[PDB]
C-alpha cells in the first residue's frame, strides 16, 4: 500500500504548483511595465518625427533664401 | 562513432564521441556543444541509469542506439 | 486509481511550465524596450537641438539678405 507515499507525494506536487503561482505573480508585476515602455517609445518617436518634419520645412525655406542671395549677387 | 541523445521534448542531438569516452565525457561533450550542464544530465537506457565513473564500453552500447536525457 | 489525481497534477504543472517559458520571454524583452525608449529620447533631443541650430543659422543669415538689400 503506497497510498501514504501517494497521498504525501500529491501534497508535494501541490507545493510545487504553489511556488509556480507565487513566482508567476512576481513575474506578472514585472511584465506590467511593457506597455509603458512601448508607449514611451512611441511618444519619443512621434516627437522626433515632428521635429524632423519642422526642420525639413525650415531647411527648404533657408535654401530658397540662400538661392535668393546667390541670384541677387 | 556518431550517436544520438533523445530528450523529453522530442529533440535528438548528434554527438561525436570515442568508445573510450566516459559517461562523464559524453556529458562534457554535451556541455561544450549544447551548453547543457553535466550535473543536470541523467542518461537512461533499458531502465538502467548510466554512472558518471564508467565509460561507453562499460554499458555495452551497441549500434543504432538511442540515449535518453533526463534533467 | 492512484493516478486519478497525480496525472492531473502533472498536467497542471506542465501547463504552468509552458506559462513560465512565455513569461521568461516577455521579461527578456523588457530591458531592450527600455534601451529603445532611451535611444528615441536621445534622437528626439538631438533632432530638436539640430533644428534650433538650423533655425539660428538661417534666421541670423536673414540679416545678410538685408545687407545685400541696401544695393
Amino acid at each position: 500500500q503506497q497510498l501514504q507515499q501517494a497521498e504525501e507525494a500529491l501534497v508535494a506536487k501541490q507545493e510545487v504548483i504553489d511556488k509556480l503561482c507565487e513566482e508567476a505573480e512576481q513575474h506578472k508585476i514585472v511584465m506590467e511595465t511593457v506597455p509603458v515602455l512601448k508607449a514611451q517609445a512611441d511618444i519619443y518617436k512621434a516627437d522626433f518625427q515632428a521635429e524632423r518634419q519642422a526642420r525639413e520645412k525650415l531647411a527648404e525655406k533657408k535654401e530658397l533664401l540662400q538661392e535668393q542671395l546667390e541670384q541677387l549677387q | 562513432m556518431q550517436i544520438f541523445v533523445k530528450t523529453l521534448t522530442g529533440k535528438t542531438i548528434t554527438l561525436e564521441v570515442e568508445p573510450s569516452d566516459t559517461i562523464e565525457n559524453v556529458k562534457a561533450k554535451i556541455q561544450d556543444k549544447e551548453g547543457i550542464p553535466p550535473d543536470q544530465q541523467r542518461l537512461i537506457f533499458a531502465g538502467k541509469q548510466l554512472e558518471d565513473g564508467r565509460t561507453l564500453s562499460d554499458y555495452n552500447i551497441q549500434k543504432e542506439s538511442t540515449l535518453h536525457l533526463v534533467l | 486509481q492512484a493516478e486519478e489525481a497525480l496525472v492531473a497534477k502533472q498536467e497542471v504543472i506542465d501547463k504552468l511550465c509552458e506559462e513560465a517559458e512565455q513569461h521568461k520571454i516577455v521579461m527578456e524583452t523588457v530591458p531592450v524596450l527600455k534601451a529603445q525608449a532611451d535611444i528615441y529620447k536621445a534622437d528626439f533631443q538631438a533632432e530638436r537641438q539640430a533644428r534650433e541650430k538650423l533655425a539660428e543659422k538661417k534666421e541670423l543669415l536673414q540679416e545678410q539678405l538685408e545687407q545685400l538689400q541696401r544695393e
Binding site: A9 | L8, I44, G47, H68, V70 | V7, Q10
Partner: peptide, 27 residues
C-alpha cells in the same frame, strides 16, 4: 514493472513516479 513513457526507464512495480524524471506511472 513499468517503463516510463517519456524516458523509457523500467521502474519497480511499486514505484508511483519514475525514479529519474519523477513523472507518474501512467503519464
Amino acid at each position: 514493472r513499468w517503463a516510463c513513457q517519456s524516458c523509457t526507464f523500467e521502474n519497480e512495480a511499486a514505484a508511483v513516479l519514475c525514479s529519474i524524471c519523477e513523472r507518474p506511472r501512467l503519464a
